């Protein structure tokens, strides 16, 4: 039982025929074939069946149909009983179209939930109950503590706390308004519009306030109360008492979407309100009685599920020896491969704890070694996160004296389990395929543990026995051993500064020492850290506390294969000052496997990471879950509790975990995690099922258009799409659910006249929904989402995330470069959603509308001419300025990241002049990993077009005062990102295990060291940037002959 191979309604069939024959197996042994509609509910089918069943022998033996339920086999190989009989036949995921009639047993509500959960996580929860692994069963039970703990924190301050969970405030991370946003106000004031639905008839009433941006929602309500009852003749004392009594009896909500102002932040800190300052948009809020909202809130009821002699390591005086016994098979041609051998190594993150050890060489057809491998490490020196990395390697040497080694299949193993027990006895490990592009012999970054796929080479090992269970020592024993070894090792004589100064005197407070610790901590995380600097950092480890953000580099300077050194490091981290999250997240990547370090990193997140920043880094924080040794850890317990107490976090927590459930390397870890989230998140699971079911209908419908109907015309495919979305099973699923891109938006009835299949080859679906909000006319009357099945969206998702962080860095330094990081969520294997940007067009669409019929070569002024026509008069200067600041930020963003092919097809412009880039998918210059050149000459095609706009149409654009201002924005912005180069290396570093082709090893991330000139000084970097931009110009002598195909007329010059 796995997930699903296809998203079709039957095994091997995308669409059931409008009427289908269903085998029914009655309780009396009879078998009845029954023609059912594919959209028939199980209620209907059972009714039709029991009427048809009277025509069959032994019919009087059947009870009433209310005493039976259906059971059948689903495409996930599961024996599913269907208690919820409201479900249509085509949405049962039946393997074969048959149904067995049985009497229902057990708790109906429990079994309905376990299906809803299994459907949402893409994996039947009965598969978890089948696992013999004690760590899996321990995780399922023990993690319920986090669930109960969070549900109590929700229902503690009822009903306000339940409203905070369901509708968390969407605020910026800081209330301080940078001065270029404050001066966009009117003397620090903003005009808001408060709406009220007054009704026997649902009429709408308007009150216009003018308030400071510091107002808490209670004061905005209070000012509304004031303006309302000023005409209502009242005494001053009653009015001052009327405002004071009823200000906390109402709440404020954004008109159009479900974003409430439930908490006491200043008004301008709310993301909707700060945005309206930037865009110069009129805020339209909706005031409702606080009790009218608490009535909508569903009662979240959480139910506990059904499944709810040791010698110390440090007294084992022996060296580590592991036995390589044999391997089942390897797939090599005996005539082309000489011999095979198992290559081993003991690792801590990425660094070996001793010399790698190889087995003897054996022939391929007989992989048996029976060979003890003896390692250069003592058993008590093994760090907590110590692992065994191995692989089967083939060797062939047919040319001269040179020899060729190649890895065949690999596997990693934690040397202690989740209970701190040193592995013992025999152990069989199923190896993994060699990743594409990997040429090394070992793979210490890949996932630990056996391949769940058991139809692979199976390498048998044996570990040593010590006549007792060996446990990693307790933390009390580790700290005590360090106290009498931290002052017994560090503090001898002064001559210990010239042999191995890891034993020097402990008060060197010189500046040459203090200023080197400053330079070391500011180096980028990918820089080489040398052996002296490791000895130097370690020798001054006690002063590193004064510069606490050096902790990453000091941790790479500890000798992890020495228990005495590690123990001292444990005591230093125990009391280490918490540091900012942007630096604690580095300790959570693949480079820091130790539990005590990662604990510290999580304690810094509990202390400084706001829910807004957790939503900002959620991608990376889910990714690093793959690097945790065990299922039960401090990072997941922190992430789980946070998602269980903020539904906006839990939404994207679900989807990002769900998105990777196809990757079998982590599908169990994320499955077990998604289960415990689903089982405890409260009412949101139902909302998610409407979302999950909505996507499956779109995946199945796009599979058809991409496979069966691929050879048909657009008009015939479009005909097929219309008739499919009008079926009752499609209208039920694709209407009335929450947009996965942004759950604040409600998707109502489909506007089928606006839905279409987009022309591109992946068959994207352009989908349009009504907005069921009563104030939908003031926000989005249209919710437009593009569904794409065929392309990997993770790069687009990462690039867009990065772009948003760059925009924050520029805002904090007074640089107003307006980006547009549109929505993009990946919902599974090469399938996801894209938020549409209303009233925006590609540069090509604007030139195709310029123009002059049959242009072949577009004129350079069409874009500037379009902007003049859209922003005539006084609003012209505000539009040109927006185009300038928006073009500048993307220019620097696309250079630092290496996003290529910037032309009129993936650059878009809003009517009001804001420019933004779309379609990334390829960054860090990874097409050139096969050729070598990381910098040639690819002139930006749209220079002259943009220069005309920036220079407001001057004839000689390069000499205008406006272009010189444009250069300074890019120069200032580029250095701004360069000053934060450690964060972006850290973010990409957290994404290594995700499986993106452009992001496989740390050498892939090294591209931004060159574009950010991290090996230079600040002046040499800026000169480097001006040169790279100068090379990337474009001017008169352009070989512009064709724009569709880009043919080039004569002048071949040969």
């Amino acid at each position: 039982m796995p997930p699903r191979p296809s998203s079709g309604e039957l095994w091997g069939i995308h669409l059931m025929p409008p009427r289908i024959l269903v085998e029914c197996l009655l309780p009396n042994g009879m078998i009845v074939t029954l023609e059912c509609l594919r959209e028939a509910t199980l209620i209907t089918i059972k009714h039709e069946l029991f009427k048809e069943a009277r025509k069959y022998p032994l019919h009087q033996l059947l009870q009433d149909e209310s005493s039976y339920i259906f059971v059948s086999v689903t495409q996930e190989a599961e024996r599913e009983e269907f208690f919820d009989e409201t479900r249509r036949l085509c949405d049962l995921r039946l393997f074969q179209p048959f149904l067995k009639v049985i009497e229902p047993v057990g708790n109906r509500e429990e079994k309905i939930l376990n299906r809803e959960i299994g459907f949402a996580i893409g994996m039947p929860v009965c598969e978890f109950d089948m696992v013999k692994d004690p760590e899996v069963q321990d995780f399922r039970r023990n993690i319920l503590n986090v669930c109960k703990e969070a549900v109590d924190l929700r229902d503690l301050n009822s009903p306000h706390s339940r409203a905070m969970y369901v509708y968390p405030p969407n605020v910026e991370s800081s209330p301080e308004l940078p001065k270029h946003i404050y001066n966009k106000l009117d003397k620090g004031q903003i005009i808001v519009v408060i709406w009220v639905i007054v009704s026997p008839n649902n009429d709408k009433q308007k009150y216009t306030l003018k308030i400071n941006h510091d107002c808490v929602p209670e004061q905005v309500i209070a000012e509304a109360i004031r303006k309302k009852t000023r005409s209502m003749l009242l005494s001053s004392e009653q009015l001052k008492l009327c405002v004071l009594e009823y200000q906390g009896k109402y709440i404020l909500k954004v008109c159009g979407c479900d974003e409430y102002f439930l908490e006491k932040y200043p008004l301008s800190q709310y993301k909707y309100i700060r945005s309206c300052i930037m865009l110069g948009r009129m805020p339209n809020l909706m005031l409702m009685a606080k009790e009218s909202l608490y009535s909508q809130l569903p009662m979240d009821c959480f139910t506990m599920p059904s499944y709810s002699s040791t010698k110390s390591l440090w007294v084992i005086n022996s060296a580590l020896r592991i036995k390589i016994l044999c391997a089942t098979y390897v797939n090599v041609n005996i005539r082309d491969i000489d011999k095979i051998y198992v290559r081993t190594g003991i690792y801590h993150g990425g660094e070996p704890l001793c010399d790698n050890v190889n087995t003897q060489r054996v022939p391929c057809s007989n992989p048996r070694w029976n060979e003890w491998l003896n390692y250069d490490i003592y058993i008590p020196d093994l760090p907590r996160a110590a692992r065994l990395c191995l692989s089967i390697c083939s060797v062939k040497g047919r040319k001269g004296a040179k020899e060729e080694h190649c890895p065949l299949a690999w596997g990693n193993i934690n040397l202690f389990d989740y209970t701190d027990t040193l592995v013992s006895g025999k152990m069989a490990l199923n190896l993994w395929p060699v990743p594409h592009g990997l040429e090394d012999l070992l793979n210490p970054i890949g996932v630990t543990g056996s391949n769940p796929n058991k139809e692979t080479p199976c390498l048998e090992l044996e570990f040593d026995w010590f006549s007792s269970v060996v446990k990693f020592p307790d933390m009390s024993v580790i700290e005590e051993h360090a106290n009498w070894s931290v002052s017994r090792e560090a503090g001898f004589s002064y001559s210990h500064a010239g042999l191995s100064n890891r034993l020097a005197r402990d008060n060197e407070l010189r500046e040459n020492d203090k200023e080197q610790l400053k330079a070391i901590s500011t180096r980028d995380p990918l820089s080489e850290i040398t052996e002296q600097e490791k000895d130097f950092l370690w020798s001054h480890r006690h002063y590193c506390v004064t510069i606490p953000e050096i902790l990453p580099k000091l941790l790479l300077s500890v000798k992890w294969n020495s228990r005495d050194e590690v123990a001292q490091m444990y005591c230093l981290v125990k009391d280490w000052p918490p540091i900012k999250p942007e630096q604690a997240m580095e300790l959570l990547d693949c480079n820091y496997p130790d539990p005590m370090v990662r604990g510290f990193a999580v304690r810094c997140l509990e202390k400084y990471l706001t829910d807004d920043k957790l939503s900002q880094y959620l991608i990376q924080l889910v990714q690093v879950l793959k690097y945790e040794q065990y299922l039960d850890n401090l990072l997941v317990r922190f992430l789980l509790k946070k998602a269980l107490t903020n539904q906006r976090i839990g939404h994207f927590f679900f989807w990002h975990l769900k998105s990777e459930m196809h990757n079998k390397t982590v599908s169990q870890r994320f499955g077990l995690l998604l289960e415990s989230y689903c089982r405890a998140c409260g009412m949101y699971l139902k909302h998610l099922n409407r979302q999950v079911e909505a996507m499956e209908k779109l995946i199945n419908l796009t599979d058809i258009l991409k496979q069966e109907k691929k050879d048909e015309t657009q008009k015939v495919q479009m005909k097929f799409l219309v008739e499919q979305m009008r079926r009752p099973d499609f209208m039920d699923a694709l209407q009335g659910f929450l947009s996965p891109l942004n759950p604040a938006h409600q998707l109502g009835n489909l506007r089928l006249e606006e839905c279409r299949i987009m022309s591109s080859a992946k068959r994207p679906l352009w989908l349009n929904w009504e907005n069921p909000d009563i104030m939908s006319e003031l926000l989005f009357q249209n919710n437009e989402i593009i569904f794409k099945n065929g392309d990997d969206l993770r790069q687009d998702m990462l690039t867009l995330q990065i772009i948003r962080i760059m925009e924050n860095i520029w805002q904090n330094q007074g640089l107003d470069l307006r980006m547009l990081p549109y929505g993009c969520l990946s919902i599974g294997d090469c399938v996801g959603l894209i938020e549409v940007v209303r009233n925006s067009h590609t540069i090509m669409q604007i030139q195709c509308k310029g123009g002059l019929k049959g242009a072949l070569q577009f004129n350079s002024h069409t874009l500037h001419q379009w902007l003049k026509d859209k922003n005539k008069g006084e609003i012209y200067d505000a539009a040109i300025d927006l185009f300038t600041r928006s073009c500048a930020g993307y220019c620097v963003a696309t250079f630092i990241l290496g996003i290529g092919d910037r032309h009129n097809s993936n650059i878009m412009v809003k009517d009001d002049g804001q420019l933004f880039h779309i379609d990334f998918g390829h960054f860090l210059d990874h097409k050139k990993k096969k050729f070598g050149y990381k910098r040639e000459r690819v002139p930006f095609v749209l220079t002259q077009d943009f220069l005309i706009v920036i220079s407001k149409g001057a004839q000689e654009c390069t000499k205008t005062r406006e272009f010189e201002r444009f250069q300074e924005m890019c120069y200032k912005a580029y250095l701004a990102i360069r000053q934060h180069a450690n964060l972006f290396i850290n973010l990409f570093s957290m994404m290594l295990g995700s499986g993106m082709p452009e992001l496989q090893s740390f050498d892939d991330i090294a591209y931004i060291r060159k574009t950010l000139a991290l090996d230079k000084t600040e002046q040499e970097a800026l000169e480097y940037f001006m040169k790279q931009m100068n090379d990337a110009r474009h001017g008169g002598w352009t070989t512009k002959m064709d724009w569709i195909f880009h043919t080039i007329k004569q002048h071949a010059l040969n």
């Binding site: 039982m1 796995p2 191979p5 095994w11 197996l25 309780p27 009396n28 042994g29 009879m30 078998i31 069959y56 022998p57 032994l58 033996l61 086999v73 689903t74 495409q75 996930e76 190989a77 599961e78 393997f95 074969q96 390897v330 797939n331 090599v332 041609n333 082309d336 491969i337 070996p352 001793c354 010399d355 790698n356 083939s394 060797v395 062939k396 040179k402 060729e404 080694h405 190649c406 065949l408 395929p433 060699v434 594409h436 040429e439 796929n453 139809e455 820089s527 080489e528 850290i529 040398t530 052996e531 002296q532 096969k930 050729f931 070598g932 050149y933 040639e936 050498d1003 090294a1006 090996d1015």
Partner: protein, 279 residues
């Protein structure tokens, strides 16, 4: 240990190469292979010894102050060979105890026929072209083979899923046969005892329908298991074909990277290395 030892012909002098250029040259080589790049100290002077011990390159920074050359303060060496090169003879444990191994295989520039093995002067001036053409052709063959490998992996996994669904489906139809014999037997003995004959054949006829269904499904699993066996073997052969190309493709990538410095004598033009080197 000589009369005069020069700076250029030393195997480690690379000039202004970056950190990434060092990663390519120090990989899977034998004891004794090392190189130098520009030091992390912004001043000129530092030379780096890189010894492979247990398959690891240890980085040891030599802090550089004043116009002298050495390891640490004060930089008081007399020749560069004493600094880095002479370690080839005696043990390297005096430098750092983390590299207790010697230096045996030198990748020599003048041992050309050991790496550059073309016979005539006309055949040498193409070994970068021949090695790169062999890389791009065999890389895309392995690319095409790996895409069949991942695809066949998915299809094989789906057949195992469909087989487990057949096993449970067959498990369920088997119960319907054993349930029918429980109920009908108390009646087939009675409908003979009650003279009813239409009812006897209807129960037999209905059990014949169940018979035909189970027989058709078992055959449907049989044809799936037959197809699983053949594709699992087709898979193993796809792996054999890749595992024979993989070690040859690894060397061609390193060989082409080795020959990047060799074509200096047959210098193919600069932008020509945008077509004489690939595209």
């Amino acid at each position: 240990m000589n009369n005069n030892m020069s700076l250029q012909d030393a195997e480690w002098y690379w000039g202004d190469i970056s950190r990434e250029e060092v990663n390519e040259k120090l990989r899977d080589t034998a004891d004794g292979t090392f190189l130098v790049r520009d030091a992390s100290t912004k001043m000129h002077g530092d030379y780096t010894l890189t010894l492979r011990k247990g398959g690891n390159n240890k980085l040891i920074k030599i802090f550089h102050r004043d116009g002298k050359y050495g390891f640490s303060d004060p930089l008081t060496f007399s020749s560069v060979v004493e600094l880095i090169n002479h370690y080839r003879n005696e043990s390297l444990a005096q430098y750092n105890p983390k590299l207790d191994v010697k230096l045996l295989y030198p990748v020599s520039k003048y041992q050309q026929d050991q790496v550059v093995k073309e016979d005539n002067i006309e055949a040498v001036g193409k070994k970068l072209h021949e090695y790169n053409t062999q890389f791009q052709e065999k890389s895309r063959e392995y690319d095409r083979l790996y895409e069949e490998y991942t695809r066949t992996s998915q299809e094989i996994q789906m057949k195992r899923t469909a087989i487990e669904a057949f096993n449970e489906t067959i498990k369920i139809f088997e119960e319907q046969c054993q349930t029918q014999e429980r109920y009908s037997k108390e009646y087939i003995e009675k409908f003979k005892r009650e003279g009813n004959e239409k009812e006897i054949q209807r129960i037999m006829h209905n059990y014949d329908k169940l018979k035909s269904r189970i027989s058709e499904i078992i055959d449907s699993r049989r044809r799936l298991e037959e197809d699983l066996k053949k594709q699992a073997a087709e898979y193993r052969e796809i792996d054999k074909r890749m595992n024979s190309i993989k070690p040859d493709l690894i060397q061609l990538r390193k060989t082409r990277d080795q020959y990047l410095m060799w074509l200096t004598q047959k210098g193919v033009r600069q932008k020509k290395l945008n077509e004489w080197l690939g595209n």
